[PDB]
């Protein structure tokens, strides 16, 4: 009770999806979506420029910009996207490069229960790989309990002075079903993500992905938004979980998929508050 009523009321307001998703529905973009029914809104989708002139449709990826506030800088925003398909790996790196993203949050394993959630889009440690026009070196990997950090260096093949470091925070322990029973791992992880992002000036939006780009993706993003409000305005500031979910859902449909994820968000915030009060 209370959480179910709140989540069910949110699910009410999305029974009609109002904003247009026509680009994702185009015949040329059909096999760029992992799920037929999960598509980016046209008005917030990431439009990919500088594509191959021989490709009739080269501007599409299943991804949306998410701003936490109406006047949010790119540095304070997110990109919510699906895990790479075999044929969108190159488009994914075009997106990272174009948006100047410096931090990637991966919320899934590559494969879970025998189903691909994300095709591997990074080289092995110390290896280099070319993804279309983009070159990626994997400089170092650091294992933590819940995640692995991959320090990647991304550049455009041939062009000088385009190299930049992209930090891939790969959350590894999310359960195959349900949500973690305690938010500690996610909070410590998001704390490292945030400090990394804030330390890079002129960084672009943080890229966050899951299999569809809405469930785990929305859960991670909304928690990050809320704890950053607490970071900025203190532990007695007012927190409106439903309105925050409404805000991100106006930019990509269906963010935060299950009531367990909904309860997990509240738990994470309450833990973050408790952590600051309890030293």
């Amino acid at each position: 009770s209370g959480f179910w009523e709140e989540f069910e009321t949110l699910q009410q307001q999305e029974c009609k999806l109002l904003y247009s998703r026509k680009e994702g529905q185009r015949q040329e973009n059909k096999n760029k979506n992992r799920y037929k029914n999960i598509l980016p809104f046209d008005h917030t989708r990431v439009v990919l420029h500088d594509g191959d002139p021989n490709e009739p449709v080269s501007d599409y990826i299943n991804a949306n910009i998410i701003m936490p506030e109406f006047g949010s800088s790119g540095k304070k925003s997110y990109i919510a996207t699906q895990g790479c398909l075999q044929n969108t790996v190159n488009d994914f790196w075009r997106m990272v490069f174009q948006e100047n993203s410096r931090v990637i949050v991966m919320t899934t394993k590559e494969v879970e229960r025998g189903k691909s959630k994300c095709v591997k889009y990074w080289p092995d440690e110390y290896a280099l790989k070319e993804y279309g026009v983009m070159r990626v070196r994997n400089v170092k990997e650091s294992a933590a309990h819940d995640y692995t950090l991959r320090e990647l260096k991304l550049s455009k093949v041939g062009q000088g002075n385009t190299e930049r470091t992209v930090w891939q925070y790969h959350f590894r322990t999310w359960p195959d079903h349900g949500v973690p029973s305690d938010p500690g791992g996610v909070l410590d992880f998001l704390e490292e993500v945030h400090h990394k992002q804030e330390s890079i000036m002129d960084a672009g939006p943080v890229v966050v992905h899951s299999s569809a780009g809405i469930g785990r993706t929305g859960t991670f993003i909304v928690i990050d938004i809320l704890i950053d409000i607490i970071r900025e305005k203190g532990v007695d500031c007012d927190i409106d979980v439903p309105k925050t979910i409404q805000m991100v859902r106006s930019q990509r449909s269906g963010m935060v998929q299950t009531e367990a994820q909904y309860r997990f968000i509240y738990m994470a915030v309450q833990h973050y508050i408790e952590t600051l009060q309890r030293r």
């Binding site: 799920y35 037929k36 029914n37 999960i38 299999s211 569809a212 809405i214 469930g215 998929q257 299950t258």
Partner: peptide, 5 residues
């Protein structure tokens, strides 16, 4: 084809 979650 359809996102169950």
């Amino acid at each position: 084809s359809d996102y169950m979650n």
